[PDB]
Amino acid sequence: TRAGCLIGAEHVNNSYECDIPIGAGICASYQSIIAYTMSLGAENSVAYSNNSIAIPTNFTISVTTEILPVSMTKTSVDCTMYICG
Amino acid sequence: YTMSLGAENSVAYSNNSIAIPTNFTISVTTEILPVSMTKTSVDCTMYICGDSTECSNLLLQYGSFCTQLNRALTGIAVEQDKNTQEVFAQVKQIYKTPPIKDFGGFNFSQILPDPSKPSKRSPIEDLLFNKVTNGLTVLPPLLTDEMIAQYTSALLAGTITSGWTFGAGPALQIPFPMQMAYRFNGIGVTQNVLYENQKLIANQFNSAIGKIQDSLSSTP
Amino acid sequence: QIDRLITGRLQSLQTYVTQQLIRAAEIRASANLAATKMSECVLGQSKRVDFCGKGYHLMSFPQSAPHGVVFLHVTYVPAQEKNFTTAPAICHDGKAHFPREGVFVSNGTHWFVTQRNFYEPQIITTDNTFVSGNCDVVIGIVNNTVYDP
Amino acid sequence: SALGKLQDVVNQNAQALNTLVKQLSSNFGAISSVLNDILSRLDPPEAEVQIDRLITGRLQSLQTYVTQQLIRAAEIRASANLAATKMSECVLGQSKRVDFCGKGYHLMSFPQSAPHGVVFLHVTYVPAQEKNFTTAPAICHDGKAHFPREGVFVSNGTHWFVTQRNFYEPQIITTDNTFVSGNCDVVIGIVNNTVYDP
Amino acid sequence: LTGTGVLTESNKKFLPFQQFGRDIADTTDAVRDPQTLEILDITPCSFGGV
């Protein structure tokens, strides 16, 4: 690889999502350990033309989670007691 | 000298007069934002001591300082890849433009990828890449420049062929002079103004894109 | 002597790692800003002033850069403005008429209604105006006819 | 691994505390890492030197710990300012900002308390089951160009309708949902269709 | 001048008064052999992270 030499992983020609990052587009996964070039996303060719539009006929009410940290543990260290007791 | 903030512009205010625009300029501006740094890793033991075993034996008296430095650098290195992942990988569908570039007079050749170049970059992106010039290791970024260019190509194809619909769900195709009219209505200007003056807006947009390329090529 | 060299090099390495952490925090803040601009200027049209360029934001285009991103903000800038005489409301038949979406303008002799960001004069009708109250309340109301289709 | 962001902060703080406790076991070049052993073994002229080595090692460790604690405090403060912005704009209102309050067109949001954190349940509207239609920018009728007030002209193959943009609801093209601007000679791609007048 | 490295042939033509060679980072990367006046590049011994 461009990151270096990888020993113990079988290089495959298929592209999957990145499980364990190696670097320079190389990722590793377990299925034995395989190494591959990652696949960014599913290909999708938009049917563009100058007089056609796509209009939705239905909808999905989708609820998603977003986790955000707010605070940490309030830690205090007695400097004199830590250094000297 | 004493500097001057700006030129004086006394606005002609009165209680019954208004100023209404009769024309418009399609203006394209550049904004450059850094995303990641060079991922550097330092072998602390080799940096302090090299191959001297007595130095490492004396360095073991100081404890796990080297482990903390390596872990902090590892956290920075994975934070750069997380930053690139959050910036560029906002779509899971790789969109392509149609082979026929009939967008109602709008030209995107300076921002779409060039098929003649092996790096698959746009001319603007190629100019941007041309304008940027002991225990130490440099880890390569997880996303290569080809895949970052592929992500930007997918984003450009989505925003050209599908509007803002691909960012909120499935990519719904729409003609570009209609997409533009929708954007005009988003800023409070009627669709008719866009439709009647579509040739002038396309010419202004192409001229502004060319001025962007000229200004990037002419400013160090 | 090796202990002196060790503590000097360790102090140098701690200084380097500390300033690298500070620069990493700054770059993370800049990258969060860049991801926000990617979401709000490229994947949609933003109403936020000067967030996606100078002027009324139309669209934006992303471009890759070495360790960075370049946003081409395509915006709408008004130009060639013209003076007009304006009024808050039109008094007609003892009723006050207010524009539904535009603004009342006058070129000197005749009164029209136009959209706010572009001069497009139209005849003041009952389709683009609405009625609220009489003419005795609004300060600066003027007398003009309101054509009924 | 759903709650990995809070657990990462908890693990980093616990690991920093464990490293700070572990640094007391190092002698930093002195004869011992225990202060009582030095004070019971040596005269004060050389115990001063040994205690000085222990003091400078432990002080360097404590200053390092306080340095990454301040850096992590800045990061957590930035995350908390972001969380307060999401609480103000997604929960207390409806946000027009794309992907700020979930994927899709944001409808509303719910806050949930979490150990040292917040979880936003973003309820969003996703379009689905899209269908092709043949579209035109304007309708030519009686020598006049008609444009939709809020919707879009669509055609299923034989008949022309106007619909709202985010949901298929075809309606008859009338004068009540269209407005007239100019003739048919200027707009590129204008098509001929009748406009019903109520 | 002592060290550890791989000593390869060098294309750097020294002036006759010069003995060692340094890069930007003040590391000895070129040297002259004292027995036979020839120039040798000193590549550092291969190392990397595991």
Ligand SMILES: *[C@@H]1O[C@H](CO)[C@@H](O[C@@H]2O[C@H](CO)[C@@H](O)[C@H](O)[C@H]2NC(C)=O)[C@H](O)[C@H]1NC(C)=O
């Ligand atoms: C709208 O019409 C276009 C073209 O008629 C459809 O696009 C084709 O879809 C099929 C089905 O997957 C593909 O095999 C073709 O390659 C597509 N053509 C192009 C040019 O992209 C599209 O699927 C239609 N939309 C809907 C919702 O049915």
Ligand SMILES: *[C@@H]1O[C@H](CO)[C@@H](O[C@@H]2O[C@H](CO)[C@@H](O)[C@H](O)[C@H]2NC(C)=O)[C@H](O)[C@H]1NC(C)=O
């Ligand atoms: C829009 O999508 C919904 C799914 O969310 C459809 O509702 C389903 O309809 C089928 C058949 O009518 C039922 O068997 C399912 O039980 C329904 N699901 C739910 C959750 O109620 C709905 O029919 C779709 N409408 C259109 C016009 O396509």
Ligand SMILES: *[C@@H]1O[C@H](CO)[C@@H](O[C@@H]2O[C@H](CO)[C@@H](O)[C@H](O)[C@H]2NC(C)=O)[C@H](O)[C@H]1NC(C)=O
């Ligand atoms: C609208 O009218 C005002 C007032 O007549 C104009 O303001 C004057 O502009 C000239 C030319 O720059 C100045 O010399 C005067 O000092 C201005 N007067 C005031 C009171 O500001 C204004 O230029 C007109 N706008 C347009 C677009 O014609």
Ligand SMILES: *[C@@H]1O[C@H](CO)[C@@H](O[C@@H]2O[C@H](CO)[C@@H](O)[C@H](O)[C@H]2NC(C)=O)[C@H](O)[C@H]1NC(C)=O
């Ligand atoms: C609005 O401004 C544009 C310029 O942005 C004007 O277009 C110019 O018109 C003149 C004469 O009609 C031509 O000589 C130029 O070549 C045009 N420029 C471009 C870029 O096309 C336009 O005429 C203005 N419209 C109004 C009503 O003032």
Ligand SMILES: *[C@@H]1O[C@H](CO)[C@@H](O[C@@H]2O[C@H](CO)[C@@H](O)[C@H](O)[C@H]2NC(C)=O)[C@H](O)[C@H]1NC(C)=O
């Ligand atoms: C879109 O823009 C490109 C670039 O401005 C145009 O390509 C130019 O075409 C002319 C004549 O065809 C050549 O003399 C130039 O050398 C071309 N420039 C480049 C950079 O290739 C292109 O014609 C425009 N229109 C379309 C439909 O692509």
Ligand SMILES: *[C@@H]1O[C@H](CO)[C@@H](O[C@@H]2O[C@H](CO)[C@@H](O)[C@H](O)[C@H]2NC(C)=O)[C@H](O)[C@H]1NC(C)=O
């Ligand atoms: C204000 O605008 C109106 C409408 O454009 C002008 O009225 C027209 O003026 C022309 C020129 O004399 C006449 O040929 C038309 O018959 C008028 N139309 C109507 C309906 O009366 C008016 O002259 C403008 N006023 C100023 C001061 O510019």
Ligand SMILES: *[C@@H]1O[C@H](CO)[C@@H](O[C@@H]2O[C@H](CO)[C@@H](O)[C@H](O)[C@H]2NC(C)=O)[C@H](O)[C@H]1NC(C)=O
């Ligand atoms: C606008 O119209 C109103 C109503 O016709 C005018 O109000 C009248 O003004 C005259 C003269 O001052 C009075 O004698 C009437 O009693 C008023 N009638 C009412 C109902 O108030 C008003 O003067 C007009 N304004 C302008 C500027 O023409």
Ligand SMILES: *[C@@H]1O[C@H](CO)[C@@H](O[C@@H]2O[C@H](CO)[C@@H](O)[C@H](O)[C@H]2NC(C)=O)[C@H](O)[C@H]1NC(C)=O
């Ligand atoms: C497009 O939609 C219109 C409206 O539903 C269709 O017109 C109706 O079609 C049905 C089916 O035969 C007839 O029974 C109705 O009488 C029609 N209504 C009118 C007002 O003519 C039309 O058939 C659809 N076209 C296509 C190609 O699907």
Ligand SMILES: *[C@@H]1O[C@H](CO)[C@@H](O[C@@H]2O[C@H](CO)[C@@H](O)[C@H](O)[C@H]2NC(C)=O)[C@H](O)[C@H]1NC(C)=O
């Ligand atoms: C839409 O209707 C207009 C108006 O009838 C058509 O324009 C006419 O076209 C014929 C032949 O092309 C000419 O002889 C007339 O002089 C035109 N009249 C006008 C006012 O322009 C137009 O062709 C129609 N378009 C379609 C697609 O049916």
Ligand SMILES: *[C@@H]1O[C@H](CO)[C@@H](O)[C@H](O)[C@H]1NC(C)=O
């Ligand atoms: C506007 O100002 C003029 C004097 O400058 C005054 O006569 C007129 O009544 C004012 N109109 C309003 C609505 O304040």
Ligand SMILES: *[C@@H]1O[C@H](CO)[C@@H](O)[C@H](O)[C@H]1NC(C)=O
């Ligand atoms: C759309 O493209 C076709 C050719 O593919 C052309 O005949 C037609 O005029 C175009 N319509 C518009 C509105 O550009």
Ligand SMILES: *[C@@H]1O[C@H](CO)[C@@H](O)[C@H](O)[C@H]1NC(C)=O
């Ligand atoms: C050392 O001896 C070798 C062979 O005897 C000779 O080639 C070389 O030039 C000598 N070096 C000097 C500095 O005399």
